Amino acid sequence: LHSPEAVHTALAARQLQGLRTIYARLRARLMGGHPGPCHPGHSFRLLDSSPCAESGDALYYRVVRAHEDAWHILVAKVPKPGADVPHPWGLELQASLSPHFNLQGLCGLVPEGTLPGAPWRGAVALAAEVPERTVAQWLAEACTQPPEEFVWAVALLLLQLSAALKFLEAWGAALVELRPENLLLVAPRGCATTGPPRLLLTDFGRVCLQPPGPPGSPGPHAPQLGSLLRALLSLAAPSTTPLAAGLELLAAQLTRLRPSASRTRGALQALLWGPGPELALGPWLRVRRGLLVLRLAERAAGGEAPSLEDWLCCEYLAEATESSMGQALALLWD
Amino acid sequence: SPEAVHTALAARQLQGLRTIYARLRARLMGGHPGPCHPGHSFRLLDSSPCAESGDALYYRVVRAHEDAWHILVAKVPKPGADVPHPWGLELQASLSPHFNLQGLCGLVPEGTLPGAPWRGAVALAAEVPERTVAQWLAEACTQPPEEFVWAVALLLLQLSAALKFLEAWGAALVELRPENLLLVAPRGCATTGPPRLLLTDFGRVCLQPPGPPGSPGPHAPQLGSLLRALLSLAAPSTTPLAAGLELLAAQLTRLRPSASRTRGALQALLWGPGPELPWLRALGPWLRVRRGLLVLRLAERAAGGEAPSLEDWLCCEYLAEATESSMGQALALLW
């Protein structure tokens, strides 16, 4: 109204409120369908006579929990014969934590005599999620993708792993080692079927209490992500794209500078979408937030669903700030 | 250089809005059955019409073109029907398909479907009728809300689009009657909201060679009279749109405006500004803001799993094609 700049501010304020509404609606569907806790009135019957998935520490079978003429599908996690538990408290933590997009949740336990005809004997915990493949099983096929196609797919799975780890670092606990065979992949709920899978962390036997320490401390997982990132990158076909060049520099920075999981997510999101080192940043983020909303509207016109990558992108752009992008760029060009 | 970024953003959302309109229009006009050939096979679906219009009984028929699946409907002449202007029926076969016109795909003579309830050779329409406008009004005006005039104004904009196509042609309809108009669901972009309107009454459409304005819209004084009848059937005039329709009916009979001027003023009541907007100076940033808000609303609906309605496609047609001179006419005709 007689001030083009006030109109520009009102448009940024409303499209950002819409961007948070878009994120919250997609998150509510993406995290929907969670089964309630197990009760004495629930009848448990087996689906899989052989493992539906295998991790490094356990075998997984589906079980149907029937009640009130309906049911939920839960997974029984059966530890492999000879498997150890370096940190038993991490299993007590798994049963104490609320649901998280990238962590394996529990809905209860099947005690002895409650599930007839099982492949195993003894009380078993019930996981809320249903597995499809391990990260190692995905790599066995995925390493045949074109250079940039494979590397992008891995870079987005790494962003999910950093978030799962950020929760744990803010919580006050850490993994002693990273093992892709205990990282499981499933299709995301309510998202396009051709996008990236949802990443679940299951290795709670390796999670231990680790106090955050002083404000100048190193990130407890940084040298594990640096070495793992280089081993995963050595599986990609060669490319000259900035994406692969930034991921190799970030691996050197993870072992050299030792950033936290929240600083790691910032630089990785900045490499995936962010500006170059030349920035100043406000106008860029305001244009990119508006462009994702236009792409979502243009594809909706064709009856196309958003993918998990678009929910993760809209999450970065909605949470991105000038101070956060300053830190993200600083690691990238240093 | 923020001024350079704001110019680039307006151009980037404009090509996206035109792409959204073209993709939703392509879904709405998708599957149009092709012309009838010796390769087509037909089967009867019913013994009673899917729509009963003033001068036609509409029966649904299956067609297959080399095993390509199509549904078409026979326009069986209703007993007592006539043709005051036979040229208008030649015009219906002549013109290209249009979203709000009743299209034809060819003739099916008697004997193709031995079990048919009709006799004689009957042409088959591309669209599949569900009800007439008079049939919708009988129930729809029984328990209207005060905002009911919203559903009527949107069907009126569609009828004005069908009449604008004929007015751009060499043609006019001499007698306008809601009992001869048809409503169907939109294809590919379907919701429970307003139906697609089809203009059917070509038996009464005559030649219109005049150049000078004369009466600019031969259909306007007829729409003004029908709109006053519709406003007395609807809920009390408590919504600004009902008051806008009351003065619009007086203007339709007083000024006899063309369908293109009726669509401008009617779109201004539906989505555009009133006299609160000289006033027209605000239209530049008003279209840029309203165009961006519709793109944002479509993305927020998609985030919730809600498809766009035919109203949202008509809204994006109005906003993508509206200009400062078109909105200047729209507002000047209303006030």
UniProtKB/Swiss-Prot annotation, chain B:
GO molecular-function term, one example from the UniProt record: protein kinase activity
Effect the entry attributes to changing residue 299 to E: Abolishes homodimerization and interaction with CRK isoform CRK-II
GO CC, one annotated term: focal adhesion
Gene Ontology terms: biological process: regulation of actin cytoskeleton organization; regulation of cell motility; regulation of cell shape
Annotated phenotype, changing residue 316 to E: Abolishes homodimerization and interaction with CRK isoform CRK-II
Family: Belongs to the protein kinase superfamily.
Function recorded in the entry: Probable catalytically inactive kinase. Interacts with CRK-II and antagonizes CRK-II-signaling. Prevents the formation of CRK-II-dependent membrane ruffling and lamellipodia-like extensions.
Subunit structure: Homodimerizes. Interacts with CRK isoform CRK-II; the interaction requires PEAK3 homodimerization.
Protein name: Protein PEAK3
Species, as recorded: Homo sapiens
Gene that encodes it: PEAK3
